[PDB]
Amino acid sequence: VLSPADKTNVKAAWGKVGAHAGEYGAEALERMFLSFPTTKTYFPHFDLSHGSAQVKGHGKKVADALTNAVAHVDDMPNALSALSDLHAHKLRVDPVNFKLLSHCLLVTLAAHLPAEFTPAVHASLDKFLASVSTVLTSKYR
Amino acid sequence: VLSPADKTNVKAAWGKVGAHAGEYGAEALERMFLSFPTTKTYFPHFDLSHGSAQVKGHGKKVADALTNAVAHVDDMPNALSALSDLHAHKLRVDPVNFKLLSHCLLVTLAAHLPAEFTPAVHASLDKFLASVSTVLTSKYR
Amino acid sequence: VHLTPEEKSAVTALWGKVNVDEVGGEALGRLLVVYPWTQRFFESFGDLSTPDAVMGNPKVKAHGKKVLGAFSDGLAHLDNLKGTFATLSELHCDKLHVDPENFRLLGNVLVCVLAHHFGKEFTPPVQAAYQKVVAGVANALAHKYH
Amino acid sequence: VHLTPEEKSAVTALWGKVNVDEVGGEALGRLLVVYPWTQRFFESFGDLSTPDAVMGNPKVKAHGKKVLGAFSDGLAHLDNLKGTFATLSELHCDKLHVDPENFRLLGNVLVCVLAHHFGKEFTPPVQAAYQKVVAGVANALAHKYH
């Protein structure tokens, strides 16, 4: 429950993401848009074509929020409270979509860091994502 | 999470349950056994026929733990720790089954407390049962 | 969908007693109150701020009556839900973009409302038959997403 | 399942490069490590206590091969997934009592495992096509449950 081993595992893998962060973020989004087309609906004002600069820009933001969250695993609710209001109150993002983006991020990580994406690291990331997801939809609980 | 309004809503419906708590816990398990037969596997040694004295007994133990949870609404993780150990570590209960039993418990409360089961009380009860579910599956993360 | 005749009979007999005016608005209203992200799709219905607002919204009541009219046609084609529902599926996926998980939520909500409206008569075997039906209608509605 | 002609082809090309002897033990083993309640169904397979214990477990790997064999079949019968998995479906419901939600998790773990193996070759549109295949298998496996 972001148990000691998980954090350390999470900090470690996000570490090798290091400076790729934003591009992984944007790739995770594009993967989500193409596999789960219902998701495109939240971004009417965006150009969601591959290459998209707006998606590249958005990806960077997504990636920065996760980096912070990792930097603050023991205090996520404080660290993500504003994004949680944004997502649940203003945008009303359906909770299922957080599982979709999480799945797409794991896919993007597996595709880019094969040597680091071990079963153990896959388990910890999955739990880190679930808990980031839990905080962001906490306004509906 | 339980907003004070929800807390209140939960104490009030649960207080109307009062003495029938055991009968309603048994009814909800019976509903779940017939609706979602996959859940039956976890109770190999029980007589699951309708009216089984075993189901009645177990229903009463479930109701008690929920009465305890309502009483310790602010400290659930503390109040239910041993139950989490049991369900997650020892029994390895698939998490999806806590949603199935939560629904069945809402359907039983709806059928027995028509005046109390208003839309806001229903919302509050769903959040509370999702919180109990969350505590009981916490060892999986 | 595979219902034995006894389940068919049980679901049809109950359904003939449903007051759609009462059941429909309660079902839709409850979905909007309990699973608040669903309100995003009904932004044109107006004020959906509090439970009281949702539950008293006339657009919500009216629409809930329609939704129930679609379950009725499915009850009349239990062995061909997918066909019965293809157009609505198209509507929900292509035009509205609703995730299919919410078809399961609304189905479960309708089940709570039927229990609420029929009380003891909504016995564990009749609930089991209705769970098969709502699972079937949900799957027929997700069809075009696949 | 409905794949475009571009998708059928892309799916085919990638599948041909899959290592039958390993990817299936890898998917099944990551399912057991990431979603631990699934170990319940394999309690007699020996030590499953650590990630290395599960992954190198000979009985896990052996059983993973058969599971991948069934996927291969479905890939060869995309237009009749249902008839193809009917018996497996009965076995998983009637004899093993696996909740069908786990078929979706397994399909998603399989996608991560193809991404892990194929890297950049596993592009967003190819992933999209495999997402449709996996959901189509989870669906067909769930048919005899109601």
Ligand code: HEM
């Ligand atoms: C891992 C979970 C997620 C994280 C960390 C995340 C993070 C963020 C951040 C940092 C922003 C920009 C905030 C600002 O500029 O003030 C944002 C906005 C946004 N998010 Fe997310 N988000 C997540 C999941 C989702 C999901 C699943 C969707 C919908 C499918 C979604 C839809 C949006 C939208 C529509 C915006 C507004 C974009 C714009 O118009 O600027 N987010 N998110």
Ligand code: HEM
């Ligand atoms: C509201 C959620 C739940 C509550 C409050 C709860 C509560 C309890 C309690 C108080 C006990 C007895 C513990 C003991 O005597 O050591 C118990 C045992 C048990 N529960 Fe649950 N339970 C819940 C959900 C479930 C679910 C979803 C399942 C599976 C579908 C399940 C299966 C079991 C089994 C198999 C046992 C052991 C039975 C026995 O051998 O005596 N529980 N539960």
Ligand code: HEM
């Ligand atoms: C699974 C059971 C469902 C059934 C049987 C159903 C049925 C219907 C029917 C009969 C209509 C009227 C369509 C027309 O006028 O041609 C409709 C419209 C609509 N449905 Fe559903 N629906 C279901 C679930 C949902 C869910 C879960 C949502 C969103 C969370 C949703 C969103 C809507 C919306 C936005 C419209 C159009 C309303 C308007 O703007 O007039 N539906 N549906």
Ligand code: HEM
């Ligand atoms: C795409 C999803 C799945 C496929 C294609 C699949 C396929 C298979 C196959 C081909 C067999 C052996 C059949 C035989 O030779 O009799 C089998 C057995 C089994 N499956 Fe699956 N399965 C899947 C998902 C799952 C999941 C998610 C679980 C549980 C978490 C599960 C649990 C089992 C078990 C316990 C056995 C029998 C093993 C034994 O006792 O020897 N399956 N499965």
